[PDB]
Nucleic acid binder design. Structure first.
Lengths: 129, 129, 129, 129, 129, 129
RNA sequence: UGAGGAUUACCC
RNA sequence: AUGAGGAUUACCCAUG
RNA sequence: UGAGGAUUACCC
RNA sequence: AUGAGGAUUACCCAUG
């Protein structure tokens, strides 16, 4: 094992899939970046800490760039026009079983599944109504 | 459209699925809960707001019950030993088109996809190694 | 669904029934008013809040007007001679099941049923004795 | 008349009905309790007073036990996890005739009638949406 | 029941119609935004308040963008070249019945009906002459 | 050619229609008043001005009276029991072509079209819910 | 500028 | 939070 | 209140 | 620790 492996972050059906690979584990923050210049790369970071005596907390962050080429000083540089940031924090009691943990993972997958309320609102630039 | 509808939060293949239904809309914050007491319910809330001049931001919260050894309908204390909390914040620059927003949703689904590093660490009560 | 619907507040057997319709949900306070000028309308408001970590509290208010026409400045205005106010607050533990909640609703219905002590005292302008 | 009599608080169709009977009259505050320990009893109290020069006011309180997972006759702590509290205040201007007062009672019954918004939100552990 | 829904702001036959969907109802201010980049979106907000003892006051706001692409340093972004701002306040005494309100609404639709002096001055970059 | 003419403010079929005729165009403020007693008349005013270097700004005002008879000392006079006041400001940058202005006009007519959220809240003495 | 008020081209 | 505290009723009071 | 301004629920 | 607090995103704020 080693769950520190690369995965496809944006599955565009085999063509133009954005895959992210392990790139740093310094300070206990696991990082994954796409194969781009660091200025245009996608980024995922994960870290877990025993926040309380009875909790463990996972901090996950994803950065999705909008790439561009910018003329700075008459010279062109690979750049990100902007970035979208996902910041998630999951707090799990120490009493949670592995099957209890699997229930949390399934709830997060269902939440974001296509056609469900939230992924729909997001993709359409609206709120829930 | 009208996205404020009931959906399957935990998919257990049609039998024993957890469905979550609209339960509150006070202040534009959409809420969905499962058919349980509130101490044992699966809960989801969502809201969008323009956080600043350049960004809009979604606040999505999920509460998941510890199910192993649970007494249905019972009084289970302390509350913290029996619940997991997910808190997601998605910041999106005002320039993101619907297409841009569709890619952000894909990035979120890929991150949580089965077999990928993050949902595997979580499901196995682990960190990255 | 959407439980935010109109209902008959005063059932006068089909003729002169006072029905109340959804009219505002600003600030998370659901409101219903009868089809009258705002000065003569019946009003119902409901709001729920997690008052404690372990309670939820519902605040319900009903205003029953005694309508009149008042000559003010030589001109006649639709007005309410007076108003009767019902203020109710229900505190429910988070541990209460849906069936536990149904028991509370049945107790409130039985309390006010015709012929029972309390609705009798009220309608006769007396106390319990 | 003489309205201080026993009545059915929870109607379960003749079988398993909860009847509440007079239990105290200290200070003109009528009390009715079910046949249980006081920690598990259904309790109702009522009193009228002229709150001010223009109004009379009824204070009606109801305590309902959490029944799911209850141990009959047992010591259940904390007390707050096992009980719901209803507190109603009805303010009525001194000009209200018996007829006016009969309409106020109808407004109260309509509000709590089955299928109407409020008792449906309560029974389903919900707010308005 | 709900009136906080999607609606056609600009009716361009049945194609090129501008639809504005619910986005946020924080602090009694309902907001509606059109789809795609928030930067190029149409925006509508609305709120009511009891301005004084006898008046209720509505505040409606509409923003019509002039869609354009901004190019700076080779990096292009979707922007609104400029925006028009409509601001309206409608004061209504509490004595107005539903019939009075319907008439106020007809007066507003009449003012802006095609061919009438006001909508004709505006559509032509003109004043009254 | 002239747009300072008579027009139907309230279209009530073809009978009971409220027509407002030109009355005064002093100081760049065009005024229109309905017939009969000025005390019970509908009033519409309009003016444009270059609010800033890039903007032109329209100020429109409408008054809908509640017709009534005032009786004081036996002397009765035709009055408006009260009035509703509509006030709108429309800011338009000088870069707007005639086509841009026509779209602004369509957005205004769309907002108030029958059945849409806003004209429906108003005609019903309501807010957004 | 103001989801500031109004006896509504007034006032804060 | 509490009040058989008040109201002109989504406001105010007192106590803690 | 304002035929006060605005980068528009801000400001005067 | 908490925030439908903010960000230029493993940083900052406020409260407790």
């Amino acid at each position: 094992a080693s769950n520190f492996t690369q995965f496809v972050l944006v599955d565009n059906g085999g063509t133009g899939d954005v895959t992210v690979a392990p790139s740093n584990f310094a300070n206990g923050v696991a990082e994954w970046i796409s194969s781009n210049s660091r200025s245009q790369a996608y980024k995922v970071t994960c870290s877990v800490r025993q926040s309380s005596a009875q909790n463990r907390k996972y901090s996950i962050k994803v950065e999705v760039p909008k790439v561009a080429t910018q003329t700075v000083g008459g010279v062109e540089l690979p750049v990100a026009a902007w970035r979208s940031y996902l910041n998630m924090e999951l707090t799990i009691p120490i009493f949670a079983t592995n099957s209890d943990c699997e229930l949390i993972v399934k709830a997060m997958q269902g939440l974001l599944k296509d056609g469900n309320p939230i992924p729909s609102a997001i993709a359409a630039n609206s709120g829930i109504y």
